UniProtKB/Swiss-Prot annotation:
Residues 1-166 form the Macro domain. This is Papain-like protease nsp3. Inhibited in vitro by GRL-0617. It is found in: Host endoplasmic reticulum membrane. The gene is rep. The chain holds residues 1026 to 1191 of 7096 of the full protein. It catalyses: Thiol-dependent hydrolysis of ester, thioester, amide, peptide and isopeptide bonds formed by the C-terminal Gly of ubiquitin (a 76-residue protein attached to proteins as an intracellular targeting signal). Responsible for the cleavages located at the N-terminus of the replicase polyprotein. Participates together with nsp4 in the assembly of virally-induced cytoplasmic double-membrane vesicles necessary for viral replication. Antagonizes innate immune induction of type I interferon by blocking the phosphorylation, dimerization and subsequent nuclear translocation of host IRF3. Also prevents host NF-kappa-B signaling. In addition, PL-PRO possesses a deubiquitinating/deISGylating activity and processes both 'Lys-48'- and 'Lys-63'-linked polyubiquitin chains from cellular substrates.
Length: 166
């Protein structure tokens, strides 16, 4: 495939220091994962950045989804359009530790990835969602069985994740 410069961690997990928006724009993958919240309010982090790159079309689509279906569950997901970034966007809600949500729900969140053969994704629950990215990577490796290409925004963190992996 067109994913370039990823370090192989396991049979099915690959990692790169990259902005997921730029990776999506260049590769145009079948599935890009959004680090969503239950309301699909794409304000910041991965979600705000993906939505900005769609010129707010992701938010417009998401507001119609919520008006029809109500909020997602923490640990849940929905498939919506990938707009100009991907064929599909898989919106996945990891627990927000800053809100006291159960970190055990991170495994449930990653299980959604197993419904898709290949994904471009961030580390769920990390960044502004408050969880330890080292833990998020371990849960990913131990939960996802399909092929996942992880884009880590921060270089300092990327290097720490690689160095501490084996
Ligand atoms: O500070 S972090 O590296 C800690 C680990 C999770 C993060 O990677 C999640 N946020 C992003 N990841 C990838 N591309 C992105 N574009 C815009 C935001 C963004 C941020
Ligand atoms: Cl973030």
């Amino acid at each position: 495939n067109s994913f370039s410069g990823y370090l192989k961690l396991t049979d099915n997990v690959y990692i790169k220091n990259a902005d997921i928006v730029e990776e999506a724009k260049k590769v145009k993958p079948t599935v890009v994962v959004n680090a969503a919240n239950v309301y699909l309010k794409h304000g910041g982090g991965v979600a705000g950045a993906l939505n900005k790159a769609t010129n707010n079309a992701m938010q417009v689509e998401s507001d119609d989804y919520i008006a029809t279906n109500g909020p997602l569950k923490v640990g849940g997901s929905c498939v919506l359009s990938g707009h100009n970034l991907a064929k599909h966007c898989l919106h996945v809600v990891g627990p927000n530790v800053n809100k006291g949500e159960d970190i055990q729900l991170l495994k449930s969140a990653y299980e959604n990835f197993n419904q898709h053969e290949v994904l471009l994704a961030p580390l769920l629950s990390a960044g502004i969602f408050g969880a330890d990215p080292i833990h998020s990577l371990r849960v990913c490796v131990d939960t996802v069985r399909t092929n996942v290409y992880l884009a880590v925004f921060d270089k300092n963190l990327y290097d720490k994740l690689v160095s501490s992996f084996l």
